[PDB]
Design a protein around this ligand. Sequence first.
Ligand SMILES: [Hg+2]
Ligand SMILES: [K+]
Ligand SMILES: [K+]
Ligand SMILES: [K+]
Ligand SMILES: [K+]
Lengths: 259, 259, 259, 259
Amino acid sequence: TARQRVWRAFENPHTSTMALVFYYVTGFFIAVSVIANVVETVPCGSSPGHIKELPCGERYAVAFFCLDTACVMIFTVEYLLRLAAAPSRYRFVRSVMSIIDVVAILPYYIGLVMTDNEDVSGAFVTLRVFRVFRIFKFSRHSQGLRILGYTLKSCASELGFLLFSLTMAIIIFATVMFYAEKGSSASKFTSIPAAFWYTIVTMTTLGYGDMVPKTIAGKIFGSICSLSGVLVIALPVPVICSNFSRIYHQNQRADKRRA
Amino acid sequence: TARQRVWRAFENPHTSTMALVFYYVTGFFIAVSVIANVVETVPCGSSPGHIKELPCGERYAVAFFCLDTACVMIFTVEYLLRLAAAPSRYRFVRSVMSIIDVVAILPYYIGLVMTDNEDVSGAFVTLRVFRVFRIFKFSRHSQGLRILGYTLKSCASELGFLLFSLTMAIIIFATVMFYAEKGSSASKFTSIPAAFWYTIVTMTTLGYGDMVPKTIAGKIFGSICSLSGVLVIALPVPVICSNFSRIYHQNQRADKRRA
Amino acid sequence: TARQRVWRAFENPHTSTMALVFYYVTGFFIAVSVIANVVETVPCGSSPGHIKELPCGERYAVAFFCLDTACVMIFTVEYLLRLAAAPSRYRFVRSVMSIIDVVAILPYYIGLVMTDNEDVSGAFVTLRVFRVFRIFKFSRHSQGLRILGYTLKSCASELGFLLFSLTMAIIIFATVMFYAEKGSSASKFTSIPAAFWYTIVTMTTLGYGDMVPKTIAGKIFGSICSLSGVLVIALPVPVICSNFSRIYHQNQRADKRRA
Amino acid sequence: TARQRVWRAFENPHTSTMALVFYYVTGFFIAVSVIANVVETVPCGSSPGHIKELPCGERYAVAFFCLDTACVMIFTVEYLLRLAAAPSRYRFVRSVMSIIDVVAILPYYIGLVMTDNEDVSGAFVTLRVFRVFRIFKFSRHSQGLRILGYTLKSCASELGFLLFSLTMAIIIFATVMFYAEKGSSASKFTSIPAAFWYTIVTMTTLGYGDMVPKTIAGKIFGSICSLSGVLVIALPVPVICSNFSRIYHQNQRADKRRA
Ligand SMILES: [Hg+2]
Ligand SMILES: [K+]
Ligand SMILES: [K+]
Ligand SMILES: [K+]
Ligand SMILES: [K+]
C-alpha cells in the first residue's frame, strides 16, 4: 500500500516533508512557466540587423525553449507519478484537473512533433494559459475560497437563469438598436451580431464608446439599456449575499457541532 | 370536456407525452425564428454583379421567406388551438402572452398584404423581436426565476420611486450641465434633451465619453453626477436584497409547511 | 381658527376636496414649468432670414414668457397663501421648502427688474431648476420613499465618512497620476486639479476615456485606481443594506404595535 | 511622569485644552500643506518675458518654499515631542504612523541637502502625498470609521483571496485577448502586459475605450471579460455586508453589555 502512501502525499502535501517540498517545487515551476509566457510575449529591443523589434521569446528563443522544456519535464513527471499512484486510472484521468494538466502540457509535445514543420503557425500556444489554472489547485487554502466556491455552486441555478434572461435581453436590445441605427452614416451597427457588442458593453456598464447611438431613437433605447445594465449589476448581489450568508453559517454550525 | 384536456396539455406540457412533444416543437421553432432573424441581418458576401454586400436575408431572400413561413404557420396553428381550448376567449386574448404572440405573428401578415407594394419599407420588421419574449414562456422552470420575478414584483413600488427620483435627478443634472456647457466651442450640449444623454450615461457609470464636459464648471458638475451614479448603482441593491431574502424564506416556509 | 384650516388643507391635501384640487393644480403647473424650460432649451428650425437655428424659447419668446408668467403667478399666490396661513412666519420661511420656492420664483422677478437691460445675460436662468425640487414635495407618498429617505438620514454619518475618505483617496491618486503623467507629450494631466477629473471618473467606474494614462507607471496607478473604484462601488451597499433593513423592520414594528 | 502626561495629551487630544489646541493647529497645518501642494501644481499665467505658463509653485517659488518651511518646522517639532514623550523609542518609531510622518517630512530635508544641486530633478516630490495620510489620524472619530475599518480587517483573508483570483483571471483574459488581437492592424495589444491594461479596465467596468477589441474573437472574449467584470463588482459586496453586519452587532452588543 505504498502507492497509496504516494497518493496520500499528493492529495495532502502537509502530511510528509517530502510531499511538501515536491508540492512547493511544483508550484514554483508553474509560476515560473506563467511568468515565462507573459514575459515571452513582451517585445524587447532590436539587435543590429533587425528591422523590427522582437519578443523576448523570439529573440531569446532558445533560452525560453530550455525553460519550457524544464517546466514540461517537471509537469510530465508530476502527471506520471500521479497516474501511477491513482487508485483508479479511469477515475483520475476523467477528473477536470487531470484534463487541465494534460491540455496544459500537450501543446509542448504538439510543437515537438511540429518541429520539422515549425514554419507554420498553430493556435496551441494560447492553450499554455491552462497552466494558470494549476495555480488554483496550489492555493485551495484560504478559509474563504471554499465558502465562496460552494456559495457559487449553490447559486448555480439562479445565476444560470440570470445569464439566460440576460442573453434574451441582449438579443432584444441588439435587435432594437440595430433597427434604430442601421440607417446612420458610417454606422457601426451593421447587423444584430454587431449590436451584440454594443449591448453587452452597455448592460455591463462598461461603455467603451466605440459603438454609441448616433440617432434619437438609438439614444432612447441606449438609455433603456443603460438602466437595464444598472439592474444587471444589482441583480446577482442579493442572490450571492443570501447564499453566502447561509453557507457561512452552515459551515460554522457544522464545525462547532464537530467542536 | 376534451377541450379542457387540450388546454390542460397547453398549460402544463408535462402532463401528456403529446403535450411535451408539441411544447418542445414550439420552442424549437421559436428559437429557429430568433436565430433566423439575427442571421438574416448579417451581411454575407457579394455575388458577381453586386456592388455592395447583401444581408443573408436579402441575398437568400426566398429561403428566409420559406423559413419564416414555416415558423409563422407553426405559431398560427399554436394560437388557433390555444384559442379553441380557451375556457374564455376574452379572458385569454386579454392576457399579455396572447398579445405578445399576436403582435409577434402580425408583421408577417402585414407584409403579406404589403407584398404587392413591398417596395416601400415598414417598421414592422423590428416587431419580430417579440418572438424572443416567447422564449420566456418556454423557460419558466428554474426554481429561482419565480423567486426573482416575484421579488421584483414586490419591489415594484420602491423601484418605481427610485426610477422617478432618478428621472428628476436626470432633469436637474442635465439642466445644470447644459447651462454650464452650452457656450463651449463645437459643444455637444446643444440643449437639455441633448444633455439627457450625457446624464443618463454618467449616472449609470457607463461613460461612453462621446459627450464629456470641456469646461471647469461642467467638470465639477460631472463629478457630482459621477458620485450620484455610484449612489444610483448602490441604491436598488438593499431593496432587492431585503425583498429577495423575505420572498425566499416565504416560499421555503410555505413549501415546508406543505411538507 | 380658519387660517389654521387653510394651513391644514395645505399640509394635508387629502382633507378637503378644495385642498386636493388646489394641490393637483399646483402640481400640474410645476410639471408644466419644468417641461416648458426643458423644451425651451431645444433648438427649433430657422425661419427665413435667420442664419442660425433658434431655441424654442428664443423663437417663441413671447409664448414662453406668457407661460412662465402664468406659472409664476400660480406659484406666487401659492406662497402668499402659505405665508398667510403659517402659524409662525419666521418658522415657515426658514424651512428648506420655503427657501426652495422663493429661489425658484425669484429669477422671474430678477429678470423683470432687468427687463430694461435684458441685453446683458444672467445666470439666474439655471436657478429655475429649483422648481424641479417642488415635484418632490408633490410626491411624498409611495410607502418606500419615507423608508429610503430616513435610511439615508441614518446612514448620514457613515456615508459622510465614506465621502471624506473618498476625497482623500482622490487627492492621493490625483497626485500620483499627475507626477506619473506630467511629462507625457500633449498630456492632459497638466496639474493635480486636472487629475481630479481622471480620478473621480476612474474611482466611480465611469471611464470616459478622455483622460487615460499614456505611461507605464500611469497605467499601474490607474489599475490601482480602478480596483479602488470597484471597492468604492461596493462599500456603501452594506451600510445602506443594514440601515434599510433596520429601518424597514422598525417602521413595520411601530405600525403593527399601533395595529 | 510628566512625559507620560505629554504622551497622554498627544494620544487623546480631548484631555487638556493645550492638547486640543495643539492637535487643531497640527491638523490645520497638514491641511494647509496638502492644499499648498495641490495649488502649487496648478499652472498660473505667464509674466512678461516668459514664453510658457508656470505653475504657482514655479512662479511663486519662494512663497511656497516659505509655506513648506513653516509646515515642516511644525511637523518636525511635532515628531520631536512625540519621540520625547514616547514610552519606548523603538516601539514608537516602528509604528506605521511614525514611518508615514518621517517619510512625509523627509523629502524636504532631501531637497535641502540637494539645494546646491537643485538643477537635477528628484522623485521625492511625489512623496509629499504622504502628508495626506496624516489627515486620517486627524479624523479617527465618526462612529462608523472604526466599524468599517475593522470590517475590512476581518474581510482581509476573503478579499485577499478575491484579489488573487482576480489577478489569475486577469492573466488568463490578457493572454486570450493578446493571442486574439496580436494580429490586427495598428493593434494596441502588443503583448500580454499590454493586455493587462485592457483586462483590468474591462473587469472593473471602467471601459476607457482606448484599447478595444477589433476582431470577432477579441469581441467574444471581451464580452466574457465584461460579464466577469459584473461578477467582480458583485462579489465583494456579500462578504463586506456579512462582516459589517456582524461587526456592527458585535460592537453594539459589547457596548450595551458595558451599558
Ligand atoms: Hg446585502
Ligand atoms: K464604465
Ligand atoms: K469610454
Ligand atoms: K461601471
Ligand atoms: K466607460
